[PDB]
Specification:
Elements: H1 18-33, H2 37-52, H3 71-83, H4 87-94, H5 96-105, H6 112-120, H7 126-130, H8 138-145, H9 147-150, E1 154-155, H10 156-173, E2 178-181, H11 183-186, E3 191-192, E4 195-200, H12 211-220, E5 224-230, E6 235-245, E7 248-258, H13 264-272, H14 275-288, E8 292-293, E9 298-300, E10 305-306, H15 312-318
Parallel strand pairs: 4-7
Antiparallel strand pairs: 1-3, 2-4, 5-6, 6-7, 8-9, 9-10
Helix pairs in contact: 1-2, 1-4, 5-6, 10-12
The protein binds magnesium ion and sodium ion (NA).
Magnesium ion binds at residues 183, 194, 196, 255.
The structure holds three DNA strands.
DNA sequence: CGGCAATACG
DNA sequence: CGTA
DNA sequence: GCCG
């Protein structure tokens, strides 16, 4: 069988329906470009269902009984099985609207609304945006200047170098503080487009005011190309690191998050992803268990109490779910 | 229809 | 609006 | 788009 929520099933990084899931995610992405979050979500879910399957889908009948597969998603798979291509998907791929929206939304500091506005104004290329720099935010300027690097896959080797750099600065800012690699790379990805770190300290309260000290020490080593700090919500910094390369360097998006150790398991769970996994997990928590989950804790609205967690295993237990290791959360 | 994760901070 |  |  196949449970309805992605958090109820192991989803490996690599699977047996790559072509089909990729096609459905094109439509998901396109739906988001047109402001259709509901449709995006369904296409994302349907694609994730195929990721969780134990073998390739070869016939349309194998879609029977599968959640989030209705008339539209089944037709897409049906055409792919029969012709090798889905005309709607190909029509989307080739369209100027999709290509331009995809180009713009990949820019750091540019979301759908902004990308949509720029498109309606007649803008189509990166150079179009560069010709009118006066109307760009500092965040967008940085994303535009470093677009080529940020669009280049980050390798696991790169991540390890970045971690030792972060751990060095963190170690000086607060002795005893720890750094944990999260996000996609914790889920076993061999390459990605950004890096996420979670920072904490074994003694509750000592992690307070840590990130400004960390950022200052990183800035002193000339490693920060862009910095956006958010105060404690955990204290967070969305950065662009200068990562040393053979004879040169490249820009990499790095997120630093500091959480008190008491909330660390919730922060780790939220920041490990995947994005769809977390959305599904929180949807499951609220609608099936009547509990409110976020990156900070798990709230029982009936008893008005927060669940204490010492580990991710605790959280899955609280929600009555079988534990899933990070590399099985690739929904 | 009513919902679709989360929600503070820049 | 954007970041997550 | 799909679910209830
Ligand atoms: Mg990130
Ligand atoms: Na982005």
């Amino acid at each position: 069988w196949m449970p309805a929520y992605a958090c109820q099933r192991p989803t490996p990084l690599t699977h047996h329906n790559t072509g089909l899931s990729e096609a459905l995610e094109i439509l998901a992405e396109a739906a988001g470009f047109e402001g259709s979050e509901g449709r995006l979500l369904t296409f994302c879910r349907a694609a994730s269902v195929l990721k969780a399957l134990p073998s390739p889908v070869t016939t349309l009948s194998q879609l029977q009984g599968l959640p989030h597969f209705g008339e539209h998603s089944s037709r897409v798979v049906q055409e792919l099985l029969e012709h090798g291509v889905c005309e709607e998907v190909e029509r989307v791929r080739r369209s100027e609207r999709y290509q331009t929206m995809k180009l713009f939304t990949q820019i750091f500091g540019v979301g759908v609304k902004t990308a949509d506005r720029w498109y309606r104004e007649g803008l189509r290329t990166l150079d179009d945006l560069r010709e009118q720099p006066q109307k760009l935010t500092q965040q967008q300027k940085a994303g535009l200047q470093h677009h080529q690097d940020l669009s280049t896959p980050v390798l696991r080797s790169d991540v390890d170098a970045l971690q030792q750099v972060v751990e060095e600065a963190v170690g000086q800012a607060l002795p005893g503080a720890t750094v944990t690699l999260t996000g996609g790379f914790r889920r076993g990805k061999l390459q990605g487009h950004d890096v996420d770190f979670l920072i904490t300290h074994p003694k509750e309260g000592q992690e307070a005011g840590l990130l400004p000290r960390v950022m200052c020490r990183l800035q002193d080593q000339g490693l920060i190309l862009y910095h956006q700090h958010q105060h404690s919500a955990f204290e967070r910094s969305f950065c662009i690191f200068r990562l040393p390369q053979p004879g040169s360097w490249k820009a990499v998006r790095v997120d630093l998050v500091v959480a008190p150790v008491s909330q660390f398991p919730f922060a780790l769970l939220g920041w490990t992803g995947s994005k769809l996994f977390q959305r599904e997990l929180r949807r499951f928590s609220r609608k099936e268990k009547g509990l409110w989950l976020n990156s900070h804790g798990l709230f029982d609205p009936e008893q008005k109490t927060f669940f204490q967690a010492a580990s991710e295993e605790d959280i899955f237990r609280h929600l009555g779910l079988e534990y899933l290791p990070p590399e099985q959360r690739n929904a």
